[PDB]
Design an enzyme around this catalytic site. Structure first.
Site, PDB file in Angstrom:
ATOM      1  CB  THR A 265     -21.002 -17.000  46.609  1.00  0.00           C
ATOM      2  OG1 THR A 265     -20.270 -18.177  46.290  1.00  0.00           O
ATOM      3  CG2 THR A 265     -21.257 -16.954  48.104  1.00  0.00           C
ATOM      4  CG  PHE A 390     -12.654 -14.839  46.212  1.00  0.00           C
ATOM      5  CD1 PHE A 390     -13.678 -15.739  45.963  1.00  0.00           C
ATOM      6  CD2 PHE A 390     -12.327 -13.921  45.224  1.00  0.00           C
ATOM      7  CE1 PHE A 390     -14.344 -15.742  44.750  1.00  0.00           C
ATOM      8  CE2 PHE A 390     -13.012 -13.917  44.021  1.00  0.00           C
ATOM      9  CZ  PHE A 390     -14.002 -14.829  43.779  1.00  0.00           C
ATOM     10  CB  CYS A 397     -12.767 -18.506  48.114  1.00  0.00           C
ATOM     11  SG  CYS A 397     -13.926 -19.475  47.138  1.00  0.00           S
TER      12      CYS A 397
END
Ligand SMILES: CC(C)C1=CC2=CC[C@@H]3[C@](C)(CCC[C@@]3(C)C(=O)N[C@@H](Cc3c[nH]c4ccccc34)C(=O)O)[C@H]2CC1
Length: 452
Positions: A265, A390, A397
């Site tokens: 990512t 996120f 995340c």
């Protein structure tokens, strides 16, 4: 008032399943959301999920008292190699909270200060590569961004050198990981996954899983034969709750998870950021001005990177238009009604379509397709749950600070050392491997001839 949910076109017994028979399923689902609006039902044999696209419904979906993280079919297929690592564990599995408690300190401010020198080691390799190009040679942007991000998580996390800037082809790890992701995305549209026409696909899958696990047992063997990094905490750290460390099977899953989650990512983010900067020359100029003013030393410091505020806003605006992990899945913890209209049963699945959420005109205004980093000047002026690159809550995340430090450092150094040219007038082509990345994006980088 208990509204009937829209549904895209069906294929008899296959219901909506064939709509995913495309190399670009997220871009296909975005077009369906444009046509059907803030919510639609998606049905395949044996399964149903509800795609959400509005801040109005997603702010409700983000209530952790009502909805928990779900393993989407995509994540169930990734769990075939990522097991009960942090990304593919259920919240209620013992190893999720245990690994969370053990590894969160590996993303402390003290930890990021400790990673900085090794992030600089890899960033300097990128700058030196581009300084060494001949006249009229170009840069393959996603390819070089993937070299940088993989090497950074390898070195900072595990004291392992993938040496990706020594290779004209991807590291074997990347080749096998991309194919595993492409297999996982492929299986999503696959009616009758037991068909013998897929026996080679299965054989190849197992092969790719063997390549990534060979590299993991080697990272582990390396460390055994002698650091205060992520691998240190995986091998030694104890959960304050149980006083227990992680077991060997889980540690292997966490290494695979962080090598995948900890670069793919971020390489997409850097690729999209450079794309939007070359397509928006006034924004490129403002970011380049900041890099020049702040990065006054040969080597950037941790403190200077914290001062690249506009570069930080460029990265958030790239995550707004093309969030590189483009969806996350939730399940209803109990019966609940969504936005006063859509009743859900306990267990019902929701999919958050992050690129669509990020295009809600009621939040961002009519200019929603424009690249404008200034949108991020004041987080208090952004409505709740409008910006979700996120994910959400306790399942957000764990690597967000690491990714944004690395990306701010590298983009800062890129804008300090080079002028960029969109020499082909590149037409955006987004390749999907569950994650999103520009394909074929090339630029020319003219050196400002500033020494390292
Ligand atoms: C690593 C992170 C960033 C990822 C997040 C993802 C979330 C949703 C996925 C994904 C984008 C891949 C393409 C399908 C999609 C959009 C999805 O909703 N799929 C649903 C529903 C579904 C599609 N096909 C299916 C076949 C069988 C069962 C369910 C499905 C699912 O996977 O659950 C996928 C990529 C990987």
């Amino acid at each position: 008032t208990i509204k009937e949910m829209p549904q895209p076109k069906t294929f008899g017994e296959l219901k909506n399943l064939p709509l995913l028979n495309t190399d670009k399923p997220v871009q296909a689902l975005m077009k369906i959301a444009d046509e059907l609006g803030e919510i639609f039902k998606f049905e395949a044999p044996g399964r149903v999920t509800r795609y959400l696209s509005s801040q109005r419904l997603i702010k409700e979906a983000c209530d952790e008292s009502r909805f928990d993280k779900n393993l989407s079919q995509a994540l169930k297929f990734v769990r075939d190699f990522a097991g009960d690592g942090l990304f593919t564990s259920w919240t209620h599995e013992k190893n999720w909270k245990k690994a969370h408690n053990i590894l969160l300190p590996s993303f402390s401010q003290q930890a990021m200060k400790g990673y900085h020198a090794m992030m600089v080691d890899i960033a300097v390799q990128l700058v030196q590569k581009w300084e060494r190009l001949n006249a009229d040679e170009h840069i393959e942007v996603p390819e070089d961004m993937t070299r940088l991000t993989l090497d950074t998580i390898g070195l900072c996390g595990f004291n392992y050198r993938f040496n990706s800037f020594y290779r004209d082809q991807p590291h074997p790890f990347i080749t096998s990981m991309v194919r595993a992701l492409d297999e996982a995305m492929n299986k999503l549209q696959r009616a009758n996954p037991d068909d013998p026409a897929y026996d080679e696909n299965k054989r190849q899958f197992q092969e790719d899983i063997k390549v990534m696990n060979d590299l993991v047992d080697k990272i582990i063997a390396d460390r055994k034969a002698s650091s205060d990094d992520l691998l240190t905490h995986m091998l030694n750290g104890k959960d304050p709750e149980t006083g227990e460390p992680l077991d060997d099977e889980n540690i292997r899953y966490q290494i695979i998870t962080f090598l995948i989650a900890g670069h793919e990512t971020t390489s997409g983010l850097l690729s999209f950021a450079l794309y939007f900067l070359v397509k928006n020359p006034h924004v490129l100029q403002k970011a380049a001005e900041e890099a020049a003013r702040v990065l006054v030393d040969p080597v950037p410091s941790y403190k200077q990177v914290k001062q690249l505020k506009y570069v930080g806003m460029v990265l958030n605006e790239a995550l707004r238009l093309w969030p590189t992990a483009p969806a996350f899945s939730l399940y209803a913890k109990e019966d609940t009604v969504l936005g006063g209209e859509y009743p859900l049963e306990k267990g019902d699945e929701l999919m958050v379509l992050i690129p669509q959420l990020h295009r809600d005109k009621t939040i961002w205004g009519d200019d929603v397709e424009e690249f404008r980093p200034e949108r991020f000047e004041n987080p208090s002026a952004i409505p709740q749950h409008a910006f979700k690159p996120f994910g959400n809550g306790q399942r957000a995340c764990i690597g967000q600070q690491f990714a944004l430090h690395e990306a701010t450092l590298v983009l800062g150094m890129m804008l300090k050392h080079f002028d960029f040219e969109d020499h082909t007038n590149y037409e955006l082509d987004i390749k999907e491997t569950l994650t999103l990345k520009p394909e074929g994006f090339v630029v020319k980088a003219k050196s400002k001839k500033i020494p390292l």
